[PDB]
Amino acid sequence: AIRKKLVIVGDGACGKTCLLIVNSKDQFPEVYVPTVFENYVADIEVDGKQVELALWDTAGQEDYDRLRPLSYPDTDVILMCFSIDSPDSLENIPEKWTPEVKHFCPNVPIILVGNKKDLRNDEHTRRELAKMKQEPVKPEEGRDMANRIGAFGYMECSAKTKDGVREVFEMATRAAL
C-alpha cells in the first residue's frame, strides 16, 4: 500500500471538518462537530492501486496561521477549499491560501474544492448574499480560479448531502500518485 499525506485548507467555516467527517462516517455532523478532525487514514483505490491517505484537518481562521505550518511537511496533496456559500472565501483562494501553500508545500498538487454545493440554489443564501451585491460562486468561477492557481483539477461537493464527496477524495488520490 502506498502511504500518502493530504492536508485540507480554506477559510474558517467553509466546511473542511464536515467534509472529512462525512467522507469517513458517511454521516453529516449535526450537534457534536469538532473544530479539527481526528486522525484518519482513508483507504482509497484508484486505477488498480490502493492508497492509504492520511488526512490532516486544519484551522482556517487567522488566529491559527502560526500553527498551521506544523501540518505542511511532506504533503502529497492539498485540498484547498472555499464555500459556494461565500465568494469572500473564494477571493481568499488567491489572496491567502495559495501563497501559503506554495511557500510551504512548493509544487504540491492542489485540488480546489467548492463546498456547500447544496447552497448554490438556496433562497436564504441567494438572499443574504444579495445584501452585499454578491451571489453564490458559479462553477466556472471555481474552474477559472482552479486554472489561475494551477490546480490539478476542480471539484464541487456537499457534505450535507454527500454530493461529490467521494469524488473529491478519489481525485486527491489521483493527484497524490
Partner: protein, 205 residues
C-alpha cells in the same frame, strides 16, 4: 519538577532519548493505532475495558498493551505533555458552543469544575499526548490538558513513519487504564488570539 519542551529542537532532543527498538509486531500495533484511534478508544470506553466482545479488537488491543507494557517502554524523566479536547470530554451535556467569541460560559464552566476538579479518574481508552504544546490539538480545541507525567510511566514516543501514520505530532502515547487526578480546572487567556480556553492540569498516578 517536570521537563517542558519549549520547541522543536527540544522535543527532538528529548525524542531521541526514548526507546524506539520495538519489535516489528510492536511497531505495527502502535502505528495501527495512530491510523484511527476511534476504533480502539471508543470500544474500550463503551465496553469499560472488557475486550471479550470483539475478537479482532481484542487481539489488536492486547498487542498494543504489550508494546506499551515493555520494560523499556518507559519515560526516563518527569515530563509535561499536552492534549486538546472537545467540550464533550466533560459529558454529552456539553458542546463547543461553551466557548463563544472567546468567552467561556461561566455558568457551565463552574458546574464542570464542581463535577471534575479534584477528581481521580481512570481512562479506558489509550491516552494520546504531545510533548510539544504547539503540536497536536491543544491550541485548536476548547479544552487543553497538561499532564504531568512521572518517571517510570509506560509510554511510546512516536514521531516517525515506522511508528505513526501522522509524524510531526511529537506524540507520547500512554497505556490504557491509566489513572490520573485532575488537580485544577481553570480559564486562561491565550497570549495571542486573546480568547478564553479551559485549561486542565492533571497528574498521572
Amino acid at each position: 519538577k517536570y521537563k517542558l519542551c519549549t520547541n522543536k529542537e527540544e522535543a527532538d532532543a528529548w525524542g531521541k532519548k526514548q526507546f524506539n527498538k520495538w519489535s516489528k509486531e510492536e511497531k505495527s500495533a502502535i502505528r495501527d493505532y495512530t491510523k484511527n484511534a476511534r476504533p480502539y478508544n471508543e470500544f474500550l470506553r463503551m465496553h469499560a475495558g472488557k475486550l471479550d466482545s470483539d475478537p479482532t479488537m481484542k487481539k489488536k488491543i492486547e498487542s498494543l498493551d504489550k508494546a506499551l507494557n515493555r520494560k523499556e517502554a518507559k519515560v526516563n524523566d518527569n515530563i509535561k505533555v499536552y492534549r486538546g479536547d472537545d467540550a464533550w470530554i466533560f459529558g454529552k451535556e456539553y458542546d463547543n458552543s461553551i466557548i463563544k467569541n472567546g468567552k467561556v460560559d461561566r455558568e457551565k464552566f463552574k458546574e464542570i469544575q464542581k463535577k471534575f476538579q479534584g477528581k481521580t479518574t481512570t481512562e479506558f481508552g489509550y491516552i494520546s499526548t504531545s510533548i510539544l504544546i504547539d503540536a497536536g490539538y491543544a491550541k485548536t480545541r476548547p479544552v487543553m490538558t497538561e499532564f504531568k507525567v512521572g518517571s517510570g510511566t509506560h509510554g511510546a514516543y512516536m514521531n516517525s513513519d515506522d511508528l505513526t501514520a501522522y509524524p510531526g505530532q511529537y506524540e507520547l502515547l500512554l497505556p490504557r487504564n491509566t489513572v490520573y487526578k485532575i488537580e485544577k480546572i481553570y480559564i486562561a487567556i491565550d497570549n495571542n488570539t486573546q480568547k478564553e480556553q479551559i485549561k486542565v492540569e492533571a497528574t498521572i498516578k
